[PDB]
Ligand binder design. Structure first.
Ligand code: TYD
Ligand code: TYD
Ligand code: TYD
Ligand code: TYD
Ligand code: TYD
Ligand code: TYD
Ligand code: MG
Ligand code: MG
Ligand code: MG
Ligand code: MG
Ligand code: MG
Ligand code: MG
Lengths: 133, 132, 133, 132, 132, 132
């Protein structure tokens, strides 16, 4: 019975997919506990959110993209919410993600991938405290 | 122009939040701000419905609106107010048109899923309530 | 707080529209009280169901069509169910039925019109007693 | 071949009956018979789950299955049993695949929306229960 | 009866092509012919809208119809022309009904997703333009 | 990268064209060209399936591909060919996954709704057949 952190990503708004995405998680019976809409997220928050990735080649590109448009931070709650939402999310790679998943049905790029979901209890607590202090 | 939308507790009870927001997103309105409320302060609800204070049902209304979560959304777009009101549909289940949010999804005069500003003024008004 | 009688019609099965139809009534929050599936309805029942129409030119054609395939008889229950379901149904005429209605979005013929719904409390009681003695 | 499907009480509680039946109808299976049960007789449920009598959860199972309405459907089609079982998805929320009925809609090992026969024999079996 | 329908550049821009076509498909209208245009020649466009050559919008309308891809489809069915015109909905985003393509999905007088013939007259002109 | 996709006669028969196309549209693949065929010339079909000329099914496969309309589409996107092949799903109704076009909607080895190129190889053969 955990809580997880999701980010509806800028490309979701660009392609008008916000409702479709959220609705998938909603149809899977998870509940909303918190929700904040950011027209433009503060870069600090984005940097923290992705700190484990600060050394990679795509960091600066990813940070740029995460602020290229609005974003919704959601906290969902449900039995084993973290691992279950990560399955709905789908693989980061457009050559891996299964048809049926959010990324498999709707995303076609390794970066513009519509949705973030906490990968673990640790990262989930950490991420929740960032978007919801 | 801009308009204020409330996703109502019966939406969360029936898991129709995405469906409702979905219909606005497709009509091509932009979210300008949004707040999720696990339970709206009552006086907030009551200010929100101040024009209704005198009506018989005003109590059941405020009750219903605090009986679960609520999302307040400000939408933006050309003629957002009148357009989104058309989408919303009539308050009365006996009158709401098929094709509308209430027409397709609502079956009750009170639990009718969605609020939207009725005019420019009420929009400015309701907006500054949920979003100061 | 009434009950009404619906018939999912043979063309609904032919075009695989049974779920779509029922789902519209289900999304409008009406409840199922009774449901019977007929691979082929007895002609007697169809004749009774449409008795008010026994003098018309289309009676024999309509009866033939109502037995040309399966049919589901449903009884729904809800506040003012009869008049509300009749609005979802849409006009019998493909030149009248509004986009948004079951017939307006999906039917294109005056006879092959997917769905029957009781027109009145009287006809509703009567019809319910036919399909559900 | 033919298979037996149960639409479960949590489907009626979440208004997902059409959605579930919807996914089978689209995979192109025909309904051969269907019965709506406002409340299934308990021994019917218990015969239905006879192979489970020994399991810890068997009580909560039977309880759940009589806590609301149920639709018993016999579907028909080539390899209906194995195909519809694939659609259904895994029993465990931790394992059900996105794309499946349980994968997309179920979030709990017990309240998992839909039963379908696991084999030819259980099909013949469960069918004659709900439909003699 | 037959009718000409254009899926317009804003449909491709907002990825609503299958949605528009799906609505017509749903009402049981059958495709008699169809061509995808990565970019229509402006002369076809001006021909298509020749009746409109004297209006303030004519030039912008035409610029728009070449700003992106277009799909030309001849649809066929009993009364396809009025029936599809109804599906299509009113041109004005302030008048088009919920339930119609424009009413649900359009929010602009010019960027309205779909063209549809208005008569047997224009049905033949327009089919002849796009399909000779 | 580009790829050839055929919407097959069973798609038209079951009115699933917009549904199939919508799935590909959803994944952000863009149409480069498209033609509707009320009935394909059998030579195009045999060309298209030339690699298959020695199989028991070849003749039936071809009969089927002419039994009704077909839509030929060249789709374009990063890795369109494998990506769309995945969307499409396995040929065998006993193997295609829920979530895929065939897995959700097909129930037959031959009447499987959609063709999609298997390689850059066949991508060019097939595009050249349908679009020269
Ligand atoms: C691995 C990778 C990630 N990214 C971006 C997009 C990812 O959503 C984000 C975080 O990476 P990661 O946590 O690996 O992906 P996921 O979002 O599936 O958990 O970094 C790239 O742009 N390129 C890459 O090669
Ligand atoms: C008119 C009416 C409204 N209400 C509730 C539901 C309405 O959403 C709310 C305000 O009514 P109103 O502003 O007329 O409806 P709308 O929400 O369409 O603007 O009060 C009742 O409970 N009973 C009634 O008879
Ligand atoms: C009026 C009419 C009805 N019918 C058939 C189809 C109708 O569903 C059925 C009953 O007629 P009616 O009760 O008028 O229509 P509805 O189903 O909308 O209540 O008779 C025709 O075939 N042709 C006609 O001209
Ligand atoms: C395995 C299991 C099943 N059940 C319930 C839900 C199952 O639908 C039912 C029978 O289990 P089973 O037949 O294994 O699942 P399926 O329904 O996929 O065939 O018993 C539990 O409540 N807890 C459990 O741990
Ligand atoms: C009336 C009008 C039309 N248009 C454009 C959009 C219309 O699709 C097109 C032709 O107008 P018209 O034929 O009246 O609309 P419809 O598309 O319903 O046939 O011209 C404008 O740009 N501005 C306007 O004020
Ligand atoms: C393997 C196989 C294919 N077919 C038909 C359906 C296939 O779409 C077509 C070509 O086969 P193949 O290229 O293997 O399938 P795909 O469509 O996945 O490329 O031949 C049969 O009719 N029977 C069979 O046993
Ligand atoms: Mg991660
Ligand atoms: Mg108001
Ligand atoms: Mg009647
Ligand atoms: Mg079993
Ligand atoms: Mg006009
Ligand atoms: Mg192959």
């Amino acid at each position: 019975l955990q809580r997880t952190l999701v980010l509806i990503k800028p490309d979701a708004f660009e392609r008008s997919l916000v409702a479709e995405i959220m609705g998938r998680i909603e149809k899977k019976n998870f509940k909303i506990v918190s929700m904040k809409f950011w027209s433009k997220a503060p870069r600090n928050l984005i940097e923290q959110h992705y700190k484990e990735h600060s050394e990679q080649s795509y960091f600066n590109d990813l940070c740029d993209f995460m602020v290229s448009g609005p974003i919704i931070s959601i906290v969902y709650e449900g039995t084993d919410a973290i691992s279950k939402i990560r399955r709905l999310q789908g693989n980061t790679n457009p050559l891996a993600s299964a048809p049926g998943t959010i990324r498999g049905d709707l995303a076609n790029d390794i970066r513009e991938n519509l949705i973030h979901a906490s990968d673990s209890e640790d990262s989930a607590v950490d991420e929740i405290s960032i978007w919801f202090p």
